Write a structure and sequence with these properties.
Largest sheet: 11 strands, mixed
CATH superfamily of the largest domain: Calcium-transporting ATPase, transmembrane domain
Distance between the termini: 67 Å
Shape: elongated
Number of domains: 4
CATH topology of the largest domain: Calcium-transporting ATPase, transmembrane domain
Helix content: 40-55%
CATH architecture of the largest domain: Up-down Bundle
Strand content: 15-25%
Number of strands: 30
Bound molecules: the ligand Nc1ncnc2c1ncn2[C@@H]1O[C@H](COP(=O)(O)O)[C@H]2OC3(O[C@H]21)C([N+](=O)[O-])=CC([N+](=O)[O-])C=C3[N+](=O)[O-], magnesium ion, sodium ion
């Protein structure tokens, strides 16, 4: 018994005992190390996978490979029992088949392993984490879930993942709800308690005092103690049940297997059609005149073709593509959770992004602020100000009219600054490490803390105070004046919050306790009946309200697009008891009969790149919808400002608020979505509905989200996008995660999606095309009787290079060139277009011709070379027998190692040229010089060394039936290959200047 048995049936002390730790200290470095060695890291077994060798063996089991590797033994164990003994070639022949076949598996394992690596390494970008308490310090630590030792103290809050099996110690919140969907199969969140369950053998649905490793905190916060980790996890003892869940294949991978297998069919027919037509040649003297031998040799030709020219692993290539793709993506702060996601991402047609934080920086600060100044019936003067310093740091002055003043010398600004600090839940904190201050709570509010500290409306000291105390200086001071009794926080219905305070130097304070109100101006204003003019209060007249509002609009609608709130108090607050501090609806009741003090106005600029990334979207034909927390006015403004909306365009109907939407009928809602770009003050549901309608127009939609309650809409979206600083519960629902929470990154991701598509297309063209040619060649020698240009072994070598090195080097092609200037790709369109197929044949076929051509040339038009048998090079089987056409031509010439070291000498170089045509799908080599993909270029040279080496190191060429050639002859190779560069080039030009899309 290594595990703590039935903690579900124990008390909190019985659990704090078994390991021995306090919920203040946590596990000491000692016990940390001790449990780390006795129980081990909280993670599954480092499963091995397989060995190279064994995998190679597995690959050696094909119908064709078993057949061929045997059909070569027959022709060898026969070439020994004949009459005419020169056995060396037939001896080494089936062995080379073996060596080559092995080298197939070599690259096989090589590339798959490469694909496997780009999978695992994705997880390095987003490790598992959790909050713990250990003896080190009394603060909250975060660590990788593998670093959690069964025994330490775990902290869980709204949006986190239970990193281990914990027994609940303290329900920090009030109602603890847990998303156990992954294990218990119960999506609906369950409530949790600290009472001990009786039955130790109780089912999960009963152990409602336990939190399971992989379940998600849905509502509230909690503390607990770890009982088991590693494999003994309630989930870990089930993960042995299913190890293989890659159940599903993208419609693209599908469409590809469909086509590629369908090609396998044609490749097979025009294979046993090659062997079949050569039946009258089963009795030739060279075959010892044996039907059996005849069928053996040509059977080798057909099968050898089958084995090479057949597509070795199409589904693998897609994989190679995504692997490599996701690697670049993740490197760009685009963490792609699912694989199919990426394929889809290319087709992204719509992007729903949130303004706050994603489209803007969220560097919250207060730009301007105003208060009433003089009121005389219709005369109403304002006090406009400006506060310098966009930072969260209190390093700025409060200008008035471009001249700095002293906030304190205005009573309006006094009450103002107080409201701020006393309506503030967050505050600041100087950080020593980074050497800067940082928010502590909601940034909206913090910017307020900053303002107060900048205002210093009590002239308190600063320079003599440390940069640590400095941060909460004036704030503390304001707390010294007022005691925060209770708070009535926000509610999207009334749009505000209030606090309640009593004076400092006062014990019997009846008419000394006040109420501080901060909320959106819209509303806060309408519930104001008085206006504070310095330390006075005059009745809140129409005209005043009228002006107040005019400014608020100027600011919000201005080239500053300012989020501004209105601050006010209640001098006549209901009895410290008359308030029932429970019901939200009642809270607005108490927040009436107010005095309007002032209006702050605040900024959170849009990320620099954004403008550009949006303009780009327009180019790539993608649509962009901003969802924001601002009113329609400000939202439209922001939209105009960042290029979502034009400077002058009529947006009347292209932007909605939650309300407006809801006040629409559904048939018209669906209608809106088709042209909407800006949504404001919407509810979490609205997202999902928006997505819905966007689907209804066959849009591929990216949806940003980061809230627990976002999860449904994200999940409904084609591409869910969760923020890196978002709920993990949100991320579990999303297809991709934004490391840098940036809208610009989204856009880059989409671009990458498109580029990957291209690379997939590149690896394909060159594959399929090369192989097309690989067949036509061997079919021509069969359709013309020509002494075959390549023999089985020669062909399997070339193949074993073409799809071995220069092929994989295409996995290193850079992105294309007009990739973003075209409209988004449709998931509906076919993988290989009609024109593309033709392109494949054109090149492919061409390669066969220049393969038999290379032979044809060394004979008929054989310059300075033997043969020169102009006509009837066709029949060569009529030579030993019917030789009245023989003239200075020995028969053993159609068996010369020259036409071979021509065909093959050309093919290998033609494949190099083809590899270069496959840099860009449509873009010329003039626009995309071949010196662009260094790696590919490298493969060429490597391959070239092997070709030379199989011609110049005697063991090789002899065994391969190949004699090297002179320069006067290499010229023919080039003069015969390079025309492909040009042919494809021509074709690309038509695809380019005629069928752009
Ligand atoms: N559905 C909605 N309907 C109306 N207003 C909303 C809505 N959603 C958010 N808001 C308000 O829009 C703002 C968010 O940007 P975003 O990132 O959300 O797009 C939010 O700021 C405050 O109320 C919020 C707020 N608060 O806790 O959330 C507290 C406030 N306070 O009293 O201190 C004031 C808010 N305010 O808007 O004035
Ligand atoms: Mg092949
Ligand atoms: Mg938000
Ligand atoms: Na989803």
């Amino acid at each position: 018994a290594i595990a703590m048995e039935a903690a579900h049936s124990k008390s909190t002390e019985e659990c704090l005992a078994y390991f021995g730790v306090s919920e203040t200290t946590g596990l000491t470095p000692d016990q940390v190390k001790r449990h780390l060695e006795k129980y081990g890291h909280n993670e599954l077994p480092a499963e091995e996978g397989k060995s190279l060798w064994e995998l190679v063996i597995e690959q050696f089991e094909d119908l064709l490979v078993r057949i061929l590797l045997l059909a070569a033994c027959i022709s060898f164990v026969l070439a020994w029992f004949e009459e005419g003994e020169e056995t060396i070639t037939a001896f080494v022949e089936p062995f080379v088949i073996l060596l080559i076949l092995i080298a197939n598996a070599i690259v096989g394992v090589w590339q798959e392993r490469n694909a496997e690596n780009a999978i695992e390494a994705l997880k390095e970008y987003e490790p598992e984490m959790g909050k713990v308490y250990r003896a080190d310090r009394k603060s909250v630590q975060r660590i990788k879930a593998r670093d959690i030792v069964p025994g330490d103290i775990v902290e869980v809050a709204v949006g986190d993942k239970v990193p281990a099996d914990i027994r609940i110690l303290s329900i920090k919140s009030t109602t603890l709800r847990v998303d156990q969907s992954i294990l218990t199969g119960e999506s609906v969140s369950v409530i949790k308690h600290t009472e001990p369950v009786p039955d130790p053998r109780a089912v999960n649905q009963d152990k409602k005092n336990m939190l399971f490793s992989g379940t998600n905190i849905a509502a509230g916060k909690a503390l607990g103690i770890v009982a088991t980790t590693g494999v003994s996890t309630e989930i870990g003892k089930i993960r042995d049940q299913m190890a293989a869940t890659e159940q599903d294949k993208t419609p693209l991978q599908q469409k590809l297997d469909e086509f590629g297998e369908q090609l396998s069919k044609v490749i097979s027919l025009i294979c046993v059609a090659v062997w079949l037509i050569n039946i009258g040649h089963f009795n030739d003297p060279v075959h010892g005149g044996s039907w059996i031998r005849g069928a053996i040799y040509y059977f080798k030709i057909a099968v050898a073709l089958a084995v090479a020219a057949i597509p070795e692993g199409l589904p693998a290539v897609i994989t190679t593509c995504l692997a490599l793709g996701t690697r670049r993506m993740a490197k760009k702060n685009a963490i792609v959770r699912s694989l199919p996601s990426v394929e889809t991402l290319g087709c992204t047609s719509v992007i729903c992004s949130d303004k706050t934080g994603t489209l803007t920086t969220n560097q919250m600060s207060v730009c301007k602020m105003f208060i009433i100044d003089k009121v005389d019936g219709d005369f109403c003067s304002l006090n406009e100000f400006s506060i310098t310093g966009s930072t969260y740091a209190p390093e700025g002055e409060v200008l008035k009219n471009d001249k700095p003043i002293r906030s304190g010398q205005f009573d309006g600004l006094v009450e103002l600054a107080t409201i701020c600090a006393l309506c503030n839940d967050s505050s600041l904190d100087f950080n020593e490490t980074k050497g800067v201050y940082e928010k502590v709570g909601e940034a909206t509010e913090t910017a307020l803390t900053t303002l107060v500290e900048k205002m210093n409306v009590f002239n308190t000291e600063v320079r003599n105070l440390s940069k640590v105390e400095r941060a909460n200086a004036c704030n503390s001071v304001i707390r010294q004046l007022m005691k925060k009794e209770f708070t009535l926080e926000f509610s999207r219905d009334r749009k505000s919050m209030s606090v309640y305070c009593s004076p400092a130097k006062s014990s019997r304070a009846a008419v000394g306790n006040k109420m501080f109100v901060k909320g959106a101006p819209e509303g806060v204003i309408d519930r104001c009946n008085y206006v504070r003019v310095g330390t006075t209060r005059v009745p809140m007249t129409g005209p005043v309200k009228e002006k107040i509002l005019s400014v608020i609009k100027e600011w919000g609608t201005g080239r500053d697009t300012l989020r501004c709130l209105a601050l006010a108090t209640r001098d006549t607050p209901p009895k410290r008891e008359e308030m029932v501090l429970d019901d939200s609806s009642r809270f607005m009741e108490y927040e009436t009969d107010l005095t309007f003090v002032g209006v702050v106005g605040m900024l959170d600029p849009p990320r620099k790149e954004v403008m550009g990334s949006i303009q780009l979207c327009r180019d790539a034909g993608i649509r962009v919808i901003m969802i924001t927390g601002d009113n329609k006015g400000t939202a439209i403004a922001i939209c105009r400002r960042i290029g979502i909306f034009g400077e002058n365009e009529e947006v009347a109907d292209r932007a909605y608020t939650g309300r407006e939407f809801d006040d629409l009928p559904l048939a018209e809602q669906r209608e809106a979505c088709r042209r909407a770009c800006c949504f404001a003050r919407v509810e979490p549901s609205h997202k999902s509905k928006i997505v819905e309608y966007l689907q209804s127009y066959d849009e591929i939609t990216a949806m940003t989200g980061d809230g627990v309650n976002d999860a449904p809409a994200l999940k409904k979206a084609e591409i869910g996008i969760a923020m890196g600083s978002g709920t993990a519960v949100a991320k579990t629902a999303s297809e991709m995660v934004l490391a840098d929470d940036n809208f610009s990154t989204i856009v880059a991701a989409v671009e990458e999606g498109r580029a990957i598509y291209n690379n997939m297309k590149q690896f394909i063209r060159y594959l399929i095309s090369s192989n097309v040619g690989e067949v036509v060649c061997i079919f021509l020698t069969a359709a013309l009787g020509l002494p075959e240009a390549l023999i089985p072994v020669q062909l399997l070598w070339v193949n074993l290079v073409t799809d071995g090195l220069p092929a994989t080097a295409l996995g290193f092609n850079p992105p294309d060139l007009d990739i973003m200037d075209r409209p988004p790709r449709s998931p509906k369109e076919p993988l290989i277009s009609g024109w593309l197929f033709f392109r494949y044949m054109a090149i492919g076929g061409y390669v066969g011709a220049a393969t038999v051509g290379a032979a044809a040339w060394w004979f008929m038009y054989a310059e300075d070379g033997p043969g020169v048998t102009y006509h009837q090079l066709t029949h060569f089987m009529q030579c030993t027998e019917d030789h009245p056409h023989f003239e200075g031509l020995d028969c053993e010439i159609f068996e010369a190692p020259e036409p071979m070291t021509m065909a093959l000498s050309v093919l290998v170089t033609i494949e190099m040229c083809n590899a270069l045509n496959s840099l860009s799908e449509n873009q010329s080599l003039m626009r995309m010089p071949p010196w662009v993909n260094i790696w590919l270029l490298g493969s060429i040279c490597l391959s070239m060394s092997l070709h030379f080496l199989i011609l110049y190191v005697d063991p090789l060429p002899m065994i391969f039936k190949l004699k090297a050639l002179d320069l006067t002859q290499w010229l023919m190779v080039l003069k015969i290959s390079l025309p492909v560069i040009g042919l494809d080039e021509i074709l690309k030009f038509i695809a380019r200047n005629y069928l752009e899309g």
